[PDB]
Amino acid sequence: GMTFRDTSAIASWHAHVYFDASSRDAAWTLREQIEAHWSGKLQLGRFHERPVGPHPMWSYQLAFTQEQFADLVGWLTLNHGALDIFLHPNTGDALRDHRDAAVWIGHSHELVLSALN
Amino acid sequence: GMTFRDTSAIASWHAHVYFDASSRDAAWTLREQIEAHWSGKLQLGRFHERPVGPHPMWSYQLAFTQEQFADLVGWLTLNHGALDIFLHPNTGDALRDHRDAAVWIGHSHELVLSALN
Ligand SMILES: [Cl-]
Ligand SMILES: [Cl-]
Ligand SMILES: [Cl-]
């Protein structure tokens, strides 16, 4: 049986906007709106135009606190268009968080979990 | 030419825990823990052991506010085990909300879109 955890186990969240060559322009446009809308509320990573790390799509990262989660995730849910977004909590166990605690705005993708740990 | 929306557009959130014959006990355990952890203050629908509405799997519904979103969604992310969970905001447009504002804890599923008419 699984042991239940409290939300205090979550130190922070990462979201990754996924895209590819076909959706690059749309991804860029959303990234500019995130900059415009969320300056100081999250850390925005580089625009990766290849698969990096465990990500099977081109991507960029947003890193944010539990206190920003509802506002930012709600806004992304409303405004993501056709871009899939991968989200996961950071609990101190990268493989477990990616393998077992993946959240998707839009469609899910099979991660490159073998890249972890 | 998307019009960006504010989270004020969201009246409420709805989650649907998906399960099947293979995963009934886990789905039930989760439901009971939801009931206990929020002391019956969330809105819980019927435990459906058949596909209902737009849901291709057996399911049960949870409804909650934007102000409950971070805690509940965090908790579900940590505690869902292998159960996929469909979430969507309610903006008054059931088609658009289900089609375009779907969020999935775990893996995404194709909805039975016919049921949205
Ligand atoms: Cl670099
Ligand atoms: Cl959208
Ligand atoms: Cl979506």
CATH of the domain at B104: 3.30.70.1240
Alpha helices in chain B, H assignment, sequence order: 24-37, 66-79, 94-100
Which of A75, A103, A104, A105 is the best substitution to test chain B (most B C-beta atoms within 10 A)? Answer: A103
Question: Chain A residue with minimal CA distance to B79?
Answer: A4
Resolution (A): 1.4
Ligand nearest to the CA of A85: 3
How remote is the CA of residue A77 from the centroid of ligand 2, in Å?
A: 6
CA distance B61 to A33: 33
For strands A12-19 and A43-44, give the pairing: unpaired
Contact B10 A75 (CB under 8 A): no
Q: How far apart are CA A109 and CA A93, in angstroms?
A: 20
Contact check, Cβ <8 Å, A79/B108: no
Whose tokens are 């006990």? That residue is B25
CB B92 within 8 A of CB B14: no
The number of domains in chain B is: 1
**C-alpha span between A23 and A26 (Å, rounded):** 5
Contacts of B35 (CB under 8 A, 6+ apart): B44
Distance (angstroms) between ligand 3 centre and the Cα of B100 equals: 4
Q: Which residues contact A77 (CB under 8 A, 6 or more apart)?
A: A105, B88, B89, B101, B103
Residue A116 burial (10 A CB sphere; 0-12, 13-18, 19+): middle
Task: Write out the residue range of the structural domain in which residue B93 sits.
Answer: 1-117
- Residues in contact with A98: Cβ distance below 8 Å, sequence separation at least 6, in sequence order: A54, A88, A111, A113, A116
Question: H or E segment at A70?
Answer: helix A66-79
User: Which residues on B lie below 8 Å from A81 (Cβ)?
Assistant: 2
Closest CA to A37 of B2, B70, B5, B10: B5
**Taking CA A66 as the corner, what is the angle to CA B31 and CA A5, rounded to the nearest 5 degrees?**
40
Nearest CA to CA, how far is A79 from chain B (Å)?
Answer: 6
The whole-angstrom distance between residue A26's C-alpha and the CA centroid of its chain comes to: 16
Return contacts of A111-114, CB within 8 angstroms, 24+ apart: A111/A54, A111/A55, A111/A56, A111/A86, A112/A51, A112/A53, A112/A54, A112/A55, A112/A56, A113/A54
